[PDB]
Amino acid sequence: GFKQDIATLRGDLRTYAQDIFLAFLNKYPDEKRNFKNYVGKSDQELKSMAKFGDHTEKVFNLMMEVADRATDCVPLASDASTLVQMSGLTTGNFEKLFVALVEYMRASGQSFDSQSWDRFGKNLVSALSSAGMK
Ligand code: FDE
Ligand SMILES: Oc1c(Cl)cc(Cl)cc1Cl
């Protein structure tokens, strides 16, 4: 289930981080509105851009840290606070990333606990809102 998933994602974090963030960008083409430098690039061309690999990996690492400290897929309010205080982002964009993550898990042949990820995303979004993210 959820804890084992974090370990599975950690064991190939750079490739899962890139492949899930590409699933997100291709499901929600308008989210490139927020990535001037990714517009007009295929998956292969993004995978050659240093900050593509290094940003996606840092984001998923942080998500894994928040997931690892969560109880029953509920993140720490402290963690939400820290995230909101870390330039312009929304709970809607986070929600979409999680929808992409869960669909990516469901289509894998691996026993990902996709329902726990869906609950975790819904609880992180609510935590961010409660901590003052628009
Ligand atoms: C959808 C989504 C999701 C997400 C998630 C996340 C998590 C968990 C964490 C995070 C963090 C962050 N962000 Fe994050 N995210 C996103 C998005 C984003 C954007 C769009 C930005 C900026 C804008 C531009 O310009 O690109 C960011 C951004 C961000 C940041 C800053 C940048 C760098 O420096 O790297 C940080 C730190 N993000 N993040
Ligand atoms: O370059 C970025 C990527 Cl690939 C993902 C996110 Cl969430 C943020 C940035 Cl700045």
DSSP H or E run through 59: helix 50-69
CA distance 112 to 32: 28
Domain range summary for the chain, segments of one domain joined by +: 1-134
SS (H, E, C) 69-82: HCECCECCHHHHHH
Which technique? X-ray
| Phi and psi torsions of 57, nearest 5° | -70, -45
Q: How far is the CA of 41 from the centre of ligand 1 (A)?
A: 19
CA distance 55 to 34: 14
Ligand 1 close to Cβ of residue 91 (< 6 A): no
Start-to-end Cα distance in the chain: 31
For tokens 């929808």, the residue is 99
Residue ranges of E strands in the chain: none
CA distance 119 to 117: 5
DSSP H or E run through 4: helix 2-10
SS (H, E, C) 37-55: CCCCCCHHHHHCCHHHHHH
Ligand 1 close to Cβ of residue 55 (< 6 A): yes
Give the 3-state secondary structure of residue 94: helix
CA distance 93 to 11: 26
CA distance 122 to 1: 17
Ligand 2 close to Cβ of residue 41 (< 6 A): no
Question: Among 108, 115, 13, 121, which residue's Cα sits nearest to residue 67?
Answer: 121
User: Residues forming the annotated binding site for heme b?
Assistant: 36-37, 51, 55, 58, 94
For tokens 């869906």, the residue is 118
